[model samples]
Target: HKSEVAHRFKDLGEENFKALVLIAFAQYLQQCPFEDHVKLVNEVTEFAKTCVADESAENCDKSLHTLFGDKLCTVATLRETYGEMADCCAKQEPERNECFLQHKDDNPNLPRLVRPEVDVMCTAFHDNEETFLKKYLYEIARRHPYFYAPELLFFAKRYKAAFTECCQAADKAACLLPKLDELRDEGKASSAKQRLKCASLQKFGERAFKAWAVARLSQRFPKAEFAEVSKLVTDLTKVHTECCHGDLLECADDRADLAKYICENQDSISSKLKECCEKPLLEKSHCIAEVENDEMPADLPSLAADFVESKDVCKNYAEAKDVFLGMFLYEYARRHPDYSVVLLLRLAKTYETTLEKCCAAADPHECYAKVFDEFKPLVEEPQNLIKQNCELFEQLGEYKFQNALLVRYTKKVPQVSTPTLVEVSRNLGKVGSKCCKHPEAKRMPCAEDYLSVVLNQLCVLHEKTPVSDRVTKCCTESLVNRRPCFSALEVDETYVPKEFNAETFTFHADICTLSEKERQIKKQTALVELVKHKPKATKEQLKAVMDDFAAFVEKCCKADDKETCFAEEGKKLVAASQAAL
Candidate 1:
């Protein structure tokens, strides 16, 4: 891994190489076992000390010993291969590193990974934690010397945690399998965010992505100066630009530069960003990933950038794209920061498509001059939906509020997945949460302004199968038109889900244990699920059942015996709801 560092930053400089190592450590420290933190900190500290003496990792044996010893091949392999690696160390700097890196795997002795049947993984761990854990690292680490470590170390730590918690449980597999499956979702969620980011860049292009990034960065770092946030984004986007092109190691290397930049400029940038960056590297990524996207900074400069225009229509649009569409975002965003980033991306996407059509026509300007009118519905349709959605939620609360979207989306795309529909209802609910608080003067823009996330999610997931025919058609439409096409879908009144009954109105007793905020989420989650199942049921029917469920929850939660009350009252509600159905 250190050899990999040298290859990447060989001629750059000592600190440059050190920083690349810094990033690897950042990434490694994130994935590292929690118990290893202080121990590794000392080795890294010494590694830094040695590097500072001559700006070369001259006496960095203990550094490599501790790190690769912990992570790479088995300890047995290290002992057997030490002399071989010592020869590499005997040679010059780069050669010594290169020779050393080549010996990480135990070649003939290294084990091939045959996945365990999921039954006996705990068998060895119960016998000996250290004994079982190393076999895992050895098999997983051998195949790829430094290939992003394959989330192996991550699960290995989880492997440890799972044993300490579940190895002694009444039904070990039961407790363990669900824990494993939960982390399974983490891997999946990470992949999906990665896919969304790449697809956005590929579909939208660099110019639009920077616009999105700038908007996104400001949302996350709203108190940071526009100039400060934009500067921070420079290397962030630079990493994405190349990283998205399919070079994983190189991209991973560049991520450190951005982390380094942020740490160095912590004061000038937002303190919120600092808190996240300072977390142990593993928690750091997810921490930043989930933070709130805030309002624009108050002191953001007026986007005085003039629109990029010319007589040749397409020439101006294509030739100076960054300046063209880029300036358009600045100008539009200045006029409308209240508009969500999705709107900016959408308008740019629309203009790009319009130009693609118009410039190929007999009279380009005549076609192109009318582009602004094309953007109206993108604003207006969502504008109206926001107003209606806010009103419905305000009047009816979660049960009826989410039922409205459930009816619309399920009716539009009859086969939309339950999770998909749930996400749709929830995110639209998000728009109502923040935006509806504004007075009517800025309300429509306020709601539509933050409506980007839901729209982005819709296009990202539904671009493939099981998303219903109408959804498929809209998803595959022109990039510019796809989202607008989705907004235009009307409910299919004939589409009703089969088999509606008491099951649609089920509730969990553990809702009593949740905090106030979490309790609301539970209700919202339950509402969307019911609406999802009982799409055919009328508002009167659904609302009546939901009301009884809510009333029962309030009475039961405040009662002396929660589980007993829920058990007694819950049966009555389900039976009544089934009778109603």
Candidate 2:
């Protein structure tokens, strides 16, 4: 049915109006607002709340469309009817504020504004409410409580109604149509602006929340108690940032205000943790020192108190000394733009000194690494900052920074090639031989792998072209690992030898085994005195020490004699492998 077919609602009393408004308000609490919805609830609930059960009252309160169709009616009746319904429902109380506090988030079935089916559906409800009054009113209050709140709905309705009135107030047809078009554009613009405002409102709530979190941190991290507060700081900051990413604007200002109020109260919650707060793991160092030096019992007044007292009595140690020191250093450092490197070096040095001093008071391991760990976050990343101010590095005559840049070249002389596996293998052998000659044996594999590949490539080239020195050299290197005999060459009677055949040859090796002599030497190296004082001589305490004393002789051919050759006298040496291998 249409508006022309059903009639319009002319009047509804306060008692009836109130019932409808309550139901509408309930729905509004659960969802975002729109105008027409609340009105429908307010209109229907007003009719039902005034139920007298008498034929006349029932008939009058019945379907609004049949009773009043475009009929002129007093505004008082319309307003009072919705108002009474709301008042009645509010007075009917529930536990606390019930779901009213969580209203906006509870409703999700709200219709989009420009949906096609809306007007048709709304018109049907208006038309049939009187005939099916019981069903219509119950559904209205339960599902659309937003419409029951006349005051809110009325204001919203009036906003659009007033705009309509403004357009009507134009006298000429030409003027009215233009004003209507302008109103349409204004409506579109307002919708876009409101969305932007919603986003900004969310950020505002987040900023307020972060400030509250930090202020609470200041209370939780009392200077007297607690280990490092940095972890706690990080956790709180992460939570606060996460809160920022939420749909905070979906909440009303009142809800945000309550959250902020609770955050502010977090400091009060600290009182419950007083047991843990009073004796923190990390406190100012001077106070700890005072605890140590006194001969008095542990119950004696703390070192912090004496430090305070000393400051009060002495001219050099004023009460504000710490405060002054902080401000002075902060300002002084701020003035020197390049002072950060100096500051870091000083910090590292101070940590080293602290470790040394602590060792004097206790074990070095117990004191040193712990202090280093605490300061590590700063020192670990100093290379980035140090590189910025390279003056000290250059002055020290060190080129490690420059060398570090070229480190890749030293590790790899790279060549990308499309060669057969055989060619690749041959080249690695040649390169491997060259690499074996380097002092560091680690380079041998790379050299070997490269030479093998080179030789393999040379073989492919040899198959296509005539042999050259390069081809021969490449092929010869592939066989460099051939074993040789040790027995062919001769040795003198004292056993010093020149060359030998592969079978009897032995390579020189270092005295790496832990023999009695090696153990004694090692023990002497770490002797208690040597360990305590690195430069101390141990031989003075060990009397009657003897080094290798046996001697032997060999024919010495001097240039001054008729024969020109050489011989030597030498001591008998203990047998062991040398490191030449």
Candidate 3:
């Protein structure tokens, strides 16, 4: 049943064999690298073969004792590893000797363990009261079998106090070592109890995590005063206290969860800190205030999405404007299921204008809050409100709504033209007005869903029709591309330009269908107005005026600067009338 290794060591007696194991212990203590380990293994194997059954224990002991004795491998091995580490202890030894002062941190169980060589080196180098006291306590904590962080930290404080009273004498090392040993021995005796507490130290882990985060932050912002750092620590700790109390260990392990918790609940935490940090006479040194002053504001667009997802309406217009148009409209659609999508879209158009006017230059959150404040009134009875403001909403098509339609269509088909835009706009207005006015109407559908259908239909219409070659050839190629085209062929009443006094651009209305009767009505109205203004004009004069007007309209009304042409032509007619008068 004996193994091969056992057979190799069997020639030596039991006591000698045990002593060989002791020699192996020496080799381990040397901490030799791989080559030495292999050499030692081979030598041990050969020495095991030489071990005779009759060999005396003393002979084996001699072999083991003399091994590495001349080289002092154990001593030299430690010296090589730690010799330079202790060099810091010897600089201008009369000083406070910061090198010997082992700093205690938050976790008692994880105390910085100084090696024996470093301690001895420090003792030989300084041997002062503070230096020896620190090293004595540090050595005891390092050697202890059980690592109860809180218990060790607690004992550390006790030893420090004991050192203050008992170890103030000239023989500081002599005085401190005994007391330090006594406390360590006592702690070692009660190590069982401490280990139990360490095992179930849930509270300790939470406190450790908080303290660790605080220390990290303190190191990060070293210039920040203790009170300032402490304020941040306190706020961060309270966030955990409220949010992650039930899952403290989870939060402790995942710092990201802790960070996310702080951000999401910053509002609540900010509110709590208001009295201490926000009031008129609040403490300026408070870290929360410092953090607020230094931190960048949240990305408005991202926060806007969060605001919508949080399902909580903005407390003010500033917050509302941070809400994106699409998200706000989507949420509004969900809330008012009874309203038509067209109505909601129309409302969105209205909101878009307010955003541009009120929110453009303001802080997004603040701007959103203001815009939504105005919007809230309109939505108090959204249906009734829309009916009353239908005209305003109707004109929305000429403004943002048309642009929205244009944007929606253009993204699908960038080459789509003005006539297409107008048709889409007209279709939305018609469908929206008809369906949204009566939710009980048999044809009624989900407002957003219906509007989506309308928009999709426009996109299809856009795809089917290729852009006119004239846009590139006649418009873009023209030297007067900078000039704007009229929305209509004639400067007539039906040609309601979207904006006043601004150059209006549209595709040629030749492609647009206008009845002959409508054209004649527009022409006759202009001639009659000119004739009425000139009371002394004869019948021959009337025919001649008509001829000139026809020529003027033919020459300029179809041009890109139709608005300018119409203005100039109207001026000539006014002059002709004034001359007659």
Candidate 4:
């Protein structure tokens, strides 16, 4: 907002604003996604209409509560600021942004910036995902109301992603601090890009900038009609306008909605992308992204100089390194037409991680040079392993999956009781049921978080007891990387083999004589003991013994002579288990 003339929004003119009084909420002009600017103005001014007439203004809180709740800041925070912020409305628009920022949080004892504690956040996240995300945005936005909404949106998304990754980590408490710090760094970068986008949008104005957007879209689809491409530009512009607020949920929802819109307007758009548009909303966004833009450098080559050329990367990245990286991707993709976009994604990922590390290193140039020469494969290892783990979790039903895990960990952690191992397996199975069975788009993080729950607990459990070499390696990890480390570790070789008491290996007539529930109890207890006594028996061998006994009961229980069948099967089961050792 400017002086008496108002900012670009002419309705904001102080003379016009005098009717609706919540001019203190002038910041909402940028922070809230008020689709109808006119209605947005009317509601607040109407509240101010009622609020100003109050002798003491106590009744003002009721109206204040309604108007304030929907904006970036909550009612409580606004009320705290309301008394002082209302005065800023009395000044011209130019002073409002500064005025609001200065007195918004005047409490001397208030923390400079409040952040969700890691332990507290993880519990909240696990309890309810959607609920906590809103709270996350609330905590972040209220603390930094002056910050751009899109910036806060990106920050919250990264927080969710990073926390999901780390909270499942073996050393979560340690993993969180550095990850959160990098988010702070990454947020600074997003600020630069937002400012860059804002400048271009302002300079070109609506018509020309939109024409330019359509120009690029049209380049990718020469056959696309002007009307079709213009429709897309307008749709995307709406997203940018609406989403640039602290409205994280709608920002993404509208992106998916944009895909649906794209597909719906199929006749107006490019034919080459018809297959992509035909895909579902959530999927088509990424599919359309994968379809290449035909625009390119006249004679671009495989990227070395485009990315590696940047010196003083810290300063460069701090400014607007996205330009350098964006161009790097453009040139590289143009030169390598057949390269999987997935690989390019990895290259960019590795390069970004490289900068974060190398820029802070004692020899930044040397580190940068080394990383470029040594191209790490971000996607390769994960793919090779994820399918194997994911497939099994899906193939095995939940209780069976838990049983499998029980067998696996029982051998790995023989010193721990069967009951504790059962509890661990139960937790792992619960996670696997949801996560492994979750949609592929979100499956990895889900699976990763699920596995980390057990691994994290195991890390703690190992401290007080005799533990395996694989689990010892688990406790050594101090990052989200621990999930893979523990998951990938091999079985311990030094785990000593033990024995079941042959005398107790009975499948007597008494088993067949018991009630159904009693028989199940008997069978389950025996199965637990089978693992408990002969702890080092291989999982497959142990499974073989159970399956073998299962067949024996099937054949013997149906036999004409129960006693003889029980006696023969009991001897056979004991012999098989002895061989199992």
Candidate 5:
């Protein structure tokens, strides 16, 4: 029968015979030990590499059609189901389907295939066995399909038994390649690293492993003196970050660990921080704190440079012999993430300019005291409101009445409720509206009007009143334009006198008086008003005009001429609006 099969293959011609032989070779390979099967992959390139000379033709033919009619029927079924792939199958009958049947009888819910993209067999073996075999098979087919014929189907049961016999007792490292490759393919680099780490730990043990890691870090940071405190901290952080499961610095205990790591290595760390502390000796403290605590630096030098570099506006702060004030400002800014460093510098500049111009009073302390009143609003809450608040009060109906109202209200302000405050602001608004036409004119005076009422009533009762809280609140809540409110009240001894020049009056105007959100709202309102007249403007065109207007407002609204900064934006909006129409 074997001789007859050989005769039949010879009659089938080259292509058909070769195809059948390849299929037979796949089946033969799958039945071999897993490593041997993997090894034969390199041995399978040329069709002539096998089936020539020394191997008996009859034996080869017999193996090619081992199950004869069974294989033919299986190929027919496979061709009907899978088309082209069936053509690649070995001529021998596949036993994988039969192996699957047996497993299905035992475990009917077994998966149909290990990986639909790569593995040819179904899940027939136990969990780990199945997983190990499937990944091996997948690698085999993907890398060396010539040796991975559909004859694997027939050999599934044999393969499973071989895995149990050979791989179950084999070294884990030898079997881990497929899983590690799969990890790389799945974009799990950290997981792959972790697995490698675990494997290394098992091989090397804990102490030696950590020593090796420190050695590696030493190699990476070769020159101790050249290393930066920040960079060293970053490198060490990377090590611990990778070592821990989640964020390495989150827990207080974890932070304590980090602190110990830095403190123990302080000598090496300090050398690296030398250049960082060359100029500002103070920076060394910040750098050391950052390294030890793993916290970000409290003040970035770039922000400090803005103060140092801007000689024109920040000259007073930049040239101050001691940086205590600068330190205070930067520290204060660190606490209030919402505030702008630029604005703070500008406010300091504004105060300096005012002091240079106005501090020539006979009693230097008295003049400085007056300077402080003008400076108080800049320091208090609703801080940036100095510019706009000043402008609003300028438009009040009666300066004396307004100033008196602000003084009185500020004196007894804290005792008032929110409702009373709101009512006070409303009544002040009403009083200002009686004398002033613009909202800006009416706003500050209303605040002043409330203060006036409070002052007069208090004076009538001969009551001594506290000033700070009332001053702060009256300044904060009394205006539609709050930016101008950061100032010495008109009633204060240090208040910029009524006869003061236009420059002093315009001082706060250059300082941003509104919070960012308030400015955005003001810009938005201005945009709406600008486009209101153009009924034909599309929403897109309107938005474009508003955006342009907002940029204009942001650029010029804090200028000394901020009162009229957007005065020309109205014309631009109208033109754009008409053009769009």
Candidate 6:
């Protein structure tokens, strides 16, 4: 008691001296007493420092009443207050003096009182961590003064349970809504949102818990039909974050239901399901149209068509190509009475003939070479129609080249079509260098205004020459050597340049210098090539081709290891930060 030590200090008024004694007693009670009459050693020295920094006593009384008595001594607040007092006292009076240090060397002789009181305060505080935190953490506003914020951990767990209960409630209420809606329109209904709100809010303890339980109900059973659920969740989540928008963000109660239904159902509801189911039907219809005729059986034709029409197939059912192809073949075999391989080969040869006669006429020379090249394999490999078709397809490079020329020169820059012969020649020269790879492609002469004189010249040469391997060689070599400057063309691995020599090639200055002698020789070479045709080798396997081309391009063309190039950027940031001083 301060009454015992009241006589020691001057001006220690009755009230002030009594309070001082009480404060000192309280501080000492925090540490154990009678632990062997105190020695000047370390432990006692440290414990002594815990004594009063403010001798006023009134200040300590205020801290005690607010932290312990009036506030019900919530644990979080007690810890915070105790910690603050210890820090403030240490900062103000850093050194130990006689009154404070006096306990350091002398045991208080009441160990039970010392240790038990310390435990009492600490245990009580621990029991109510949330209340203690709320009591100390926030600045209590003057209006209706709420002391603490809700404990997040408790709230989180409660919210999850709340969602479960709310979902059940929503399920019950969902069936009754139509009737209620009718009544509400007639003004016979109670306000469900309001009623639900009160019901939800009332479940929680405090006036500060403003979000009504109906908010939980709205999210769980969001009644706007499947079509609108996605938009609703997005709108709700955005407006619900802690600081800026609604209180929904902090509402942990809805999380369990969200994890279960909101996320899963949102994705499920939005997934354009009609598109998903329609894929197989489309592939089946495509297969039916592709092979209904007594033409080649569905199976083999379907496989080929699938390769040709991959762009038409849906990505999800990629197997449609092979499956439909096989089905078509089996069905076609049932209908075609004379389904012999020989008949099919002959029929396919007719396609080759048509390609040569009609398709080649617009651009005579190269077109004829390309067409003859197309059917050469049929004449060589009489037994294999599939192999022949593949050969025709492979050598159709010339047609593709012609298509590209039309795209680049005639179509892209329309004005160039009517250029003067000299201007046309200059443009053709540019196209010539790039177009060499497609030797069988003849430039169109009579098509609209001439796109380029150079291409016209090439076309003229093609027209003058005949359709044959030897003639194709002659035309290619004559064009290459006749150019003012020559660039060697190194094509794929199968191209053996030495075999197609200068002797087989008749060099001319340009189409302007084509002689009768050269024309006769070109005609003869065409005949010889037709009599002794050679099918080019098949290409690199499709196994490697199937790897995604865009992915490969991205990986190989990468200039930076990471897209953000963070490694280099971070170094720059550090340098900039250093320079800021």
Which candidate's lDDT is highest?
1
Global CA lDDT of candidate 6, please?
A: 0.29
- TM-score of predicted model 5? 0.17
Candidate 5 lDDT (Cα, 0 to 1): 0.37
Q: Superposing all C-alpha atoms, what RMSD in Å does each candidate have to the true structure?
A: 10.8, 34.8, 34.3, 16.7, 31.3, 36.5
Return whichever of 2 and 5 wins on lDDT: 5
Model 5 poorest 10 in a row by lDDT: 100-109
lDDT of 6 at 320: 44
lDDT (10s digit) by residue, model 3, range 39-125: 544555555455443344223434232332322332445446435423433443322122322221113344454434434533443
**Each prediction's whole-model lDDT (CA):** 0.58, 0.31, 0.41, 0.56, 0.37, 0.29
Q: Write the per-residue lDDT of candidate 6 for residues 1-581, one digit (tens) a residue.
A: 22112122233333332322222223322332222112211222222222243333332323221212222222233344344323222322212121232232222233231212323333444576433322211111111111111222222233234323433453534433433333322221112222222332343222212111112222233222323433433433432222121121123223323333433443333232233333332122222212212222234332234322334323312344323322222232223323232222233334335433544355433343333234345333322422332244355443332222232232212222222222332333334333332322111111101222233344344446443343244334322122211112222233222232223322222312345435333423322221112112112221122122223323433544443433344344334422331
Model 1 lDDT tens row, 87-152: 443455445444544554423343454646445776777776654765455444434334333243
Ten residues in a row with the worst lDDT in model 4? Answer: 1-10
Candidate 4 ranges with C-alpha deviation above 4 Å: 1-378, 394-396, 460-473, 502-540, 553-572
lDDT of 2 by residue, 327-426 (tens): 2222222222222322323343344455346545544344443553454554333333233324333442222222221121111211112122222322
- The RMSD (Cα, Å) of candidate 2 is 34.8
What value does the lDDT take at residue 301 in candidate 4? 47
After best superposition, candidate 5 residue 327: deviation in angstroms? 4.2
| Residue runs of model 1 more than 4 Å from their true location after superposition | 1-38, 54-195, 202-237, 243-330, 349-369, 396-424, 438-486, 492-496, 500-534, 548-581
Model with the higher lDDT, candidate 2 or 3: 3
lDDT of 5 by residue, 5-57 (tens): 34433444444344333344333223234444333323322322234532354
Residue 121, candidate 4: Cα error in Å is 32
| TM-scores for every predicted model | 0.54, 0.18, 0.18, 0.38, 0.17, 0.13
Sort by lDDT, best first. 1, 4, 3, 5, 2, 6
Judge candidate 3 against the unseen true structure and give its global Cα lDDT, from 0 to 1: 0.41
lDDT of 1 at 498: 50
Worst 10 residues of 2 by lDDT: 482-491
- For 470-507, candidate 4 gives per-residue lDDT tens digits of 66765664332455565565555555655557665787
lDDT of 1 at 261: 67
